[PDB]
Amino acid sequence: KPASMYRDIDKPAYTRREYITGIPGSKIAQHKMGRKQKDADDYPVQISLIVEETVQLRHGSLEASRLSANRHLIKELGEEGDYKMTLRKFPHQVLRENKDGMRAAFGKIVGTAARVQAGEQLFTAYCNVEDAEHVKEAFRRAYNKITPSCRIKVERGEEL
Amino acid sequence: MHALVQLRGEVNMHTDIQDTLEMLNIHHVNHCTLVPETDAYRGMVAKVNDFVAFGEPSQETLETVLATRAEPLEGDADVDDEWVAEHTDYDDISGLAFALLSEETTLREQGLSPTLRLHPPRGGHDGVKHPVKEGGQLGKHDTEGIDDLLEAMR
Amino acid sequence: FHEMREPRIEKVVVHMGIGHANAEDILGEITGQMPVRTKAKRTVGEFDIREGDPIGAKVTLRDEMAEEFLQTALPLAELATSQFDDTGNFSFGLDVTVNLVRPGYRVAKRDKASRSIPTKHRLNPADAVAFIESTYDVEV
Amino acid sequence: PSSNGPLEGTRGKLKNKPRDRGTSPPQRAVEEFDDGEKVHLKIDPSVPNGRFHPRFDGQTGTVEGKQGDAYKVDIVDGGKEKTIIVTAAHLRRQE
Amino acid sequence: ATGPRYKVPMRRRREARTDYHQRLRLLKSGKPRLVARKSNKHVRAQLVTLGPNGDDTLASAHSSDLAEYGWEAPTGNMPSAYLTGLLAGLRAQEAGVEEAVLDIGLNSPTPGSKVFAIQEGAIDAGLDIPHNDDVLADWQRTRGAHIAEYDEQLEEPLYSGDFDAADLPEHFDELRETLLDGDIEL
């Protein structure tokens, strides 16, 4: 289905699994990536990806982006390069669809999304001053698969 | 002592606000009242902040106005020094004007109508869709600004 | 100081956990005072469905009735370290347990303005072994 | 609502804050009021008997005599005047 | 203690000195409480009224100041208890107090106990207290017959300091007697 159906925030927060059922499983396979044993302070550079508009990101978008995003870093830095990217958000908001007529319209659970207020960090990478351009390119790809426009901001990087 | 001036009509304005205005003895657009400055009186103007023009006038202007627009409690009688003196515990406009500002008496306490029915601002005002800060005419004013208007509404 | 601190026994409970009694007799003989039945809670697959029903008995010995029983009781047992309670109590087994504690203990067992005993005034495993040991028998 | 019972949607008003749990002091379950005195109606979650209809929490009434040991406070719901029977345990002297 | 959600009992309950649940029932009557409390060596009998900041004591009576009138005996027995009661009963009679409800505190409603024996004295003093006759001890044990016949089982004095060997429950009568006297400085 189109993201148009669930990109804005207009329903009440809907996440009480204790009342909701048939909630589809997350398509996300890893929130921690790269060398997840090292640390964030172990790196000079810390570039995160910031969402410019508050929205909802269906897990299919997170994974779709996170994938092609990280997949780049794996390519340009090796399946064991010296980096560690992270996706801090999680798909809590449950999404329904009324699939009859308008009678008894409450839908049936079909997905999960992550509410991300504008200005927040969807992703946060940690790399060495060299691969800083491979991470920026790794985000240029990722922000093409989520709905909002974004900013690639450096949290620690005087090397420029 | 502040000069309250309704600059926006009644249609569509909340009722609790309009009721406040009428409480402050002001019933029509362009009507003006001289309100003290207490906590109670503050709450009211604050609440009317958007359909009014207010501030403290210069003794000078306050006079210019009282002269031109003050009225008895009933009648056409012009409120001029003589009138003022023959009925008010004062001796002339300036005398009265000073007390109002010093907040010692009230147009009513004297036998004057709480309202000073002004005339449309000559040359027009700075608009009723924005405050004074945004370049409009609504809200609190500069003792000079307030005058600029009241003056213009002789 | 040493006097109001030197230990003593408050109660010695003798109890036989059975599960369905005829065992009372022996305790009445061996202790010197009547026994008391024991019930339980929760159903047990081991045909122990009836909640409130005789399962065992016991007897609380105080003062002489206790000592006199211990003079013979203690000898019949081989005391060990891992057989002591952090509060200076020991059980061995027909079970026989002994509750030891310093003088002003009533402060906690009374009704009016009772109080729990400060960790300090609490008897210690060590202080326990000592006192006891110092009365006809060995430790270890 | 979904049901029209007295306690409908009264989870909030009829429940003590954690540290106010358990039994309440007797000093106020015995407080003696004088006819005419203004009092604030507020149910004590910890107290069971002598409660007025929840809908009246927050009302400030005027003791107009008592029935038994309980009081007969006068209040005004919207525009209709009503005589509420409540026990001291659920009352506080105004001012 | 643990955290915010924690609940610490009312002070007087931690201390374990006041039984609020029972207290309330008491406070209801509206009548003053005839507080009866024991002590190893003593026995007190206060008459309390309710107040804006806390209970008020309009009339007490301690077994200690029981000697103040001529008591050379111990101060923690039935004879003692009764008397102390009748003493407070009188003082209270001197404050305008006419009726009260026995507040035996955390003690026990045991038959013939000093408390009921304390309650019996305040009644005799003129006060009006809801009681149960057959719960009170027999006039003699109130006197000290139970104790006198104990020293009969002598061989060793019942007391340390010499009040007397055989003890004088008569003294009980002597003191009680002295209380019904109008003069007596209360």
Added chain:
RNA sequence: CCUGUCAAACUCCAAACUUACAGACGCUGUUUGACGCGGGGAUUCCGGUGCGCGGGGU
């Protein structure tokens, strides 16, 4: 220990705000009689829109 996130049917917190009663000012009423009380006669019980807050539904 360190680290990454949530809640219409969670809450150690907590507004703005709404709300009971009273006082004050304002306003109003005592020939325009308010507040309140009793009686006669209704109409009405298809609503709509803007805005704020919503719940459902792409």
Added chain:
RNA sequence: AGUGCAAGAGCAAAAGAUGACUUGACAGUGUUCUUCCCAACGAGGAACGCUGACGCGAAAGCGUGGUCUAGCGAACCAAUU
């Protein structure tokens, strides 16, 4: 934890557990609120009084059913006191 049963709420020298005694789940008549916010409307419901009789307790006191909010029904007709 337990407290019969939804959920939310109340409760710890108790409203929970045990023991014993007891049968107030009694008769009758009211006040108030609710039912129906405001604001009229029945049955039903609840809190709170009074009279009579009981139960327990040393006593204050507690018991008009089960801790609170669901478990309910007009006339006509029939039976019964």
Added chain:
RNA sequence: UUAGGCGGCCACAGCGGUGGGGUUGCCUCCCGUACCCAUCCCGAACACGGAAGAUAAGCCCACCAGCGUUCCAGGGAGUACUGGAGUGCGCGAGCCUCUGGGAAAUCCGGUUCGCCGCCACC
């Protein structure tokens, strides 16, 4: 209050800890079961009677902030949110200005190791 009884507020009072304190005084632990009373077994408790001993508990007194809690300073923050107004901006979700209010988390620094009432009493 050189140690007590009854309380109100019901953690600023909790939790944990250190130090001091008692010859006919107080409170206790304590000593003891003939009686009132008592334990589904125990004078443990409850109840009764009494001082040989003790200040080790308790309790009273002084003090400690590590945990919990109350309030306060500064920082966060006039930030989040928000009552009123706008021919202000944005495709839009939404944002902004003016006016009146205004947090929470957390951090650092103070406070807090109870306060007050009546009665009795070297």
